[PDB]
Amino acid sequence: TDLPRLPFDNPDIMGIAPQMLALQKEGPIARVGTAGEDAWLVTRYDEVRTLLADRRLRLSNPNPQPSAKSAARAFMVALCAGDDHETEPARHAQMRSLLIPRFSTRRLRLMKTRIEHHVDELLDQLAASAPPVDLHRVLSFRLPTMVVCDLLGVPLADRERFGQWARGTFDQSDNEHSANTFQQVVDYMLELVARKRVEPGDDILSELIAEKDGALSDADIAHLGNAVLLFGYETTIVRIDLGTLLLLRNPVQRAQLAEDPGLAPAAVEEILRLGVGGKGSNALIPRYAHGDITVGETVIRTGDAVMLAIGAANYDDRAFPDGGLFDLTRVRPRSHLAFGHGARHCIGRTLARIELTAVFERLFRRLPDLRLAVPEESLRWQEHRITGGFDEIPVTF
């Protein structure tokens, strides 16, 4: 008997670590070590989906002497209103209540139109340039930051100011850098709130300022805007990179999609399901048990940490036949867990799907000879950032 320790090694640049798949073959739940507390690791689709819907399993830590966390994880939990287990029910309910109507069908319809034109322009610029080109910098990075500028109602050049702040805030390796970056986010957002109070527009902070006849404080409003800024582009960038790499790996699927862009929605769902990078520490949703929960044979006790492996679950053969295969022709595939499930189900997921669909409708049609200009093995998943990701994707075309 050898206690497994997260994170597990992955000899590939994508996919699930072999040891996590081995645990998943054994059963749905295993006790593992981490860099901090030991935790229950749940790796099968059915059990992860069930626990994501279990109101006893929450983000906030109920423990009296809570384990220490990196500055990055503390900021992420506070942005998600999970920093105080006694106030999480009301604060999280208000958070979702205030954020969900900012992504209305009216707004998403307008943004889809703008996103499509912007991808067209981004790809014209790419196709006219001289290889090798960093696809990450000129495509993956540019579309989601454009979108966040649209949501916040700021000039597009602002993303050159804030484009690295998600990475810096969520740098688990440097508490000083994390804290200094977050202060920059706070300073910027407070500037923006004060501007929108006298110069509002069709944007998210203006709507919050107007909300409940102005009942929200500027600190409340900036807090929600920080969540939009820090959650609203970085993970989407990562999915554009992973989707590009996955399609480059599967030429038959890529050719199907180039021929029929109507397969883009199905490709986007396969990209989300299979898009896991490096050791995939970001494909785990963390929780604490606020009450005892039984998982098959295993009792999770109040206070226990739980890692719900949405990545592993999305690869689960029990839920997806040939779960490791990229397949554009899956008949009625189960809903993947890449946006989570239940109480904290991703608020931006419809917008994120709009962005990924617009890209992969166009990418291999516009650049039919696109391919990596370096070996895959030279691509470097950034394990120290909560959101992982590659720093560059050199391509030719």
What are the E-state strand segments in the chain? Answer: 29-32, 39-42, 57-58, 133-134, 285-289, 293-295, 298-300, 305-308, 371-372, 394-396
Tokens linked to 16: 């699930």
Binding to ligand 7PF (CB under 6 A) within 238-297 occurs at: 282, 285-286
Residues 327, 270: Cα–Cα separation, whole Å: 7
Q: Which is nearer to ligand HEM, 130 or 268 (CB)?
A: 268
Distance CA 181, CA 169 (A): 5
CB 138 within 8 Å of CB 125: yes
Residue 387 in contact with ligand 7PF, rule: CB under 6 A: yes
Residue 346 marked ligand-binding = yes
Percent of the chain as helix, strand, coil, to the nearest 5: 55, 10, 35
Residues contacting ligand HEM: total by CB under 6 A? 21
Number of chain positions touching ligand 7PF (CB under 6 A): 8
Closest CA to 272 of 322, 335, 211, 332: 335
**Does 42 participate in binding ligand HEM (rule CB under 6 A)?**
no
The one-letter code for the residue type at 29 is: I
Query: What is the spatial order of strands in the sheet that 29-32 belongs to?
Result: 29-32, 39-42, 305-308, 285-289, 57-58
Among 339, 360, 364, 381, binds ligand HEM (CB under 6 A): 339
Q: Does residue 172 belong to the site contacting ligand 7PF (CB under 6 A)? A: no
By a kind-dependent CB cut-off of 5 to 8 A, residue 282 interacts, out of ligand 7PF, ligand HEM, none, with: ligand 7PF
Shortest spacing between CB 129 and ligand HEM, in angstroms: 26
Q: Which residues contact 297 (CB under 8 A, 6 or more apart)?
A: 27
Write the interaction track for ligand HEM spanning residues 65-104; mark x where CB under 6 A is met and - where it is not: ---------------x---------------x--x-----
Site string for ligand HEM, 270-289 (x = CB under 6 A): ---------------x----
Shortest spacing between CB 58 and ligand 7PF, in angstroms = 13
- Which x/- pattern, by CB under 6 A, does the window 347-376 give for ligand 7PF? ------------------------------
Catalog residues that contact ligand 7PF under the rule CB under 6 A. Answer: 231, 235, 282, 285-286, 386-388
